[PDB]
Design a protein around this ligand. Structure first.
Ligand SMILES: Nc1ncnc2c1ncn2[C@@H]1O[C@H](COP(=O)(O)OP(=O)(O)OP(=O)(O)O)[C@@H](O)[C@H]1O
Ligand SMILES: [Ca+2]
Lengths: 19, 371
């Protein structure tokens, strides 16, 4: 089930800003 | 209940919390110890100093770099960095934070394990992981395939990657990067007449470099045009109101990456070392690589390096080939971002190495979990 790990790295995420 | 991401640079430690868009702290990967006893007296019982705190207190100290060319070498000093990081930079308790670490490409089996050990046994983390400094950079751009050019302060690595794994058989290293460049910049400036000796002027040639340097498309053109008309000059003001002026030194400094012959390196020019790699690969895939060339690391920040990589990897590859150089604006904190990203993933939780997993299998576990 690592394939879904790239399925994700591809799709993306939303990192919280700072400062 | 959040995780920690620490990115080891042989020049800078970049650490922060997973889930955030940039390292909260970044500092000098150094360890300063008193040159002799007379310096320990007033110490007030503390042993060493680290990062910026080890800078300003230079004379009394003996600085050492725990990381050489990317690979950790002075362990006990890497243990002192890590500490300072966790407690002094992030202000967190290792013991209660998962932690994503980065290993340079071709990280030694032992270095991988040694590092593991220290994290769980010395720092007692709840769980931790290790990622190849390069792969993250790629991931940070949303790619699970491509060939990454990691160029920091100490080392320059060319990395090909298919469906997640790197291809250690096609890894191309180059012991020429930042420090070196900054340093040449000096040689060429000194030749110019200026005088950069003190350790202070060194940090001046770095700032200088950092802010007035780029990568020419047609070198001998910009070279010829640089000495025929003053049109390409710029001037820099030092701390005491004194001004210097950088001539062609502007692109003669970064030119090295493409011409290691400058500083005396029989090694191949990065442009080449990049081609040379896409070639060490299975015929049917390079196709994708040639197109997904992605850059990371402080030294690939020189402007016009992408516009120059095109120019070269292009002319070396097939007439029909399609090349596309991916150079992200924050290509500096690329590596770190990856780890952040990686760690904030759901499909990733199931992949950490837990304190309790480390106790029945030992540290040789690094090879079965971190692929
Ligand atoms: N805009 C810029 N142009 C050129 N060089 C730059 C720029 N910004 C930073 N640098 C140089 O990048 C280097 C730092 O790069 P990076 O942060 O990738 O290094 P690192 O991780 O410490 O090294 P390594 O890859 O050996 O671990 C320094 O030499 C720094 O002066
Ligand atoms: Ca690095």
């Amino acid at each position: 089930g690592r394939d879904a790990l790239l399925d994700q790295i591809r799709q993306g995420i939303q990192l919280k800003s700072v400062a | 209940t959040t995780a920690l991401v620490c990115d080891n640079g042989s020049g800078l430690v970049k650490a922060g919390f997973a889930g955030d868009d940039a390292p909260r702290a970044v500092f000098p990967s150094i360890v300063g110890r008193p040159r002799h006893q007379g310096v320990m007296v007033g110490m007030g019982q503390k042993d060493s100093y680290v990062g910026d705190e080890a800078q300003s207190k230079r004379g009394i100290l003996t600085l050492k770099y725990p990381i050489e060319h990317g690979i950790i070498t002075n362990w006990d000093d890497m243990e002192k960095i890590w500490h300072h990081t966790f407690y002094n930079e992030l202000r967190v308790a290792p013991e209660e934070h998962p932690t994503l670490l980065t290993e340079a490409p071709l990280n030694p089996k032992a270095n991988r394990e040694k590092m593991t050990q220290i994290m769980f046994e010395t720092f007692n983390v709840p769980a931790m992981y290790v990622a190849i400094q390069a792969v993250l950079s790629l991931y940070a751009s949303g790619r699970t395939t491509g060939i990454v050019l990691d160029s920091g302060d100490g080392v320059t690595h060319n990395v090909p990657i298919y469906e997640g794994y790197a291809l250690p058989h096609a890894i191309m290293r180059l012991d020429l990067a930042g420090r070196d460049l900054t340093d040449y910049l000096m040689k060429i400036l000194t030749e110019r007449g200026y005088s950069f000796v003190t350790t202070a002027e060194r940090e001046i040639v770095r700032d200088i470099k950092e802010k007035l340097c780029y990568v020419a498309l047609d070198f001998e053109n910009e070279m010829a045009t640089a000495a025929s008309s003053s049109s390409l000059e710029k001037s820099y003001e030092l701390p005491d109101g004194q001004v210097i002026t950088i001539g062609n030194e502007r692109f003669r400094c970064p030119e090295t990456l493409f011409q290691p012959s400058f500083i005396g390196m029989e090694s191949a020019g990065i442009h080449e070392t990049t081609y040379n790699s896409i070639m060490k690969c299975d015929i049917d895939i390079r196709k994708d690589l040639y197109a997904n060339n992605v850059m990371s690391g402080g030294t690939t920040m020189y402007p016009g390096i992408a516009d120059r990589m095109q120019k070269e990897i292009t002319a070396l590859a097939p007439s029909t080939m399609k090349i596309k150089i991916i150079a992200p604006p924050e290509r500096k904190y690329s590596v770190w971002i990856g780890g952040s990203i990686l760690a904030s993933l759901s499909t990733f939780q199931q992949m950490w190495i837990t304190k309790q997993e480390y106790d029945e299998a030992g540290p040789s576990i690094v090879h079965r979990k971190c692929f």
